[PDB]
Amino acid sequence: SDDRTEVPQLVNANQYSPCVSIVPSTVWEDGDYYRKQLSPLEGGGWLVA
Amino acid sequence: CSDGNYNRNASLNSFKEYFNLRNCTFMYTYNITEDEILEWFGITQTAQGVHLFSSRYVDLYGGNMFQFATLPVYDTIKYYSIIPHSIRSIQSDRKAWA
Amino acid sequence: NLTKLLSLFSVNDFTCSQISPAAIASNCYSSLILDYFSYPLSMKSDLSV
Amino acid sequence: FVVRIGAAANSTGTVIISPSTSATIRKIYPAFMLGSSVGNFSDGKMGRF
Amino acid sequence: YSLYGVSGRGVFQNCTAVGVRQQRFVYDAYQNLVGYYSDDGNYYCLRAC
């Protein structure tokens, strides 16, 4: 939610990216981008990859 | 729960009425001896998977928890809920559950 | 303070492209350009990206 | 998390659905649903993994 | 000795009887192991060089 800040997520060792839910198992074309709106419980705003 | 013929799939079957299980990577079973003894259960996760702990096998009478399984779950667990269970007794068979 | 400025006026429409109105209040930028002019609400369908 | 199971077993307690009815308490085991992503069911209720 | 868990140099003796016995070392308040487990199944308590 626009607020005052934006952040980039770094995975802890031994975990998958939070974006594996929206990035296909193989990328169709170089530079494709993925988005998913977040529920108010998930934090609101968007997830983007 | 009739003597000598417990239904080992009763809860699983009830769960399967609400959900179809699809693409299961594992289904493990752990046998439990029947008693009314206090016990402790624990769960953590590392990059090695999900770790289950119990007092039952190593410290049944004292409560210390020890690891009894590592589950090949490598997607980080972020959420959990308690699955409600209800006991389909008839009125004269009603018990209180701890 | 832009929500300051938009509290003077009565605001009838707010649409953004490649950003949101929520986001455009919050973020920091290296350059902000404000273009203003007289313009009738009747011609809203013609003021579009 | 850790879980205390069966602590009240053998004591006398209510049947819950019929509060005026007491019975000997028996241990019962907990059940858990755990995962990486949650949301709502089709009718809007929470708790979908 | 060279246990799968750790290296080391010790004098094993059939000692008694302190441990966990389910996982298979025993330490004494430091990095060292004093020291039985692993043998099948007895108490080969180790010592320093």
Please give a structural write-up.
Chain D: This is Spike glycoprotein. Chain D: Belongs to the betacoronaviruses spike protein family. Chain D: Homotrimer; each monomer consists of a S1 and a S2 subunit. The resulting peplomers protrude from the virus surface as spikes. The structure is cut from a larger assembly and holds five copies of chain A. With 49 residues, the first copy, chain A, is mainly β. Chain A is globular, with a radius of gyration of 12 Å. The first copy, chain A, has a two-stranded antiparallel ribbon with strand order 1-2. Chain A has strands at 35-37, 46-48. Chain A contains no helices and two strands. Chains in contact: A-B, A-C, A-D, B-D, B-E. Chains B and D meet through strand 1, strand 4 and strand 5 of B and strand 1, strand 2, strand 3 and strand 4 of D. Strand 1 of chain B pairs antiparallel with strand 1 of chain D, so a sheet runs across the interface.
Alpha carbon gyration radius of chain A? 12 Å
* Binned strand content of chain A: 5-15%
- The topology string of helices and strands of chain A comes to EE
Outline the biggest β-sheet of chain A: 2 strands, antiparallel
Give the proportion of residues in helices of chain A: under 10%
Q: What would you call the structural class of chain A? A: mainly beta
How many beta strands in the DSSP annotation of chain A?
2
Number of helices of chain A: 0
Largest interface: B-D, 29 and 37 residues
Please list the strands of the largest sheet of chain A in the order they lie side by side.
Answer: 1-2
Shape of chain A: globular
Describe the oligomeric state of these chains in a short phrase.
part of a larger assembly
State the distance separating the first and last CA atoms of chain A.
Answer: 17 Å
Function (chain B): Spike protein S1: attaches the virion to the cell membrane by interacting with host receptor, initiating the infection.
Subcellular location (chain B): Virion membrane; Host endoplasmic reticulum-Golgi intermediate compartment membrane; Host cell membrane
Family (chain B): Belongs to the betacoronaviruses spike protein family.
Protein name (chain B): Spike glycoprotein
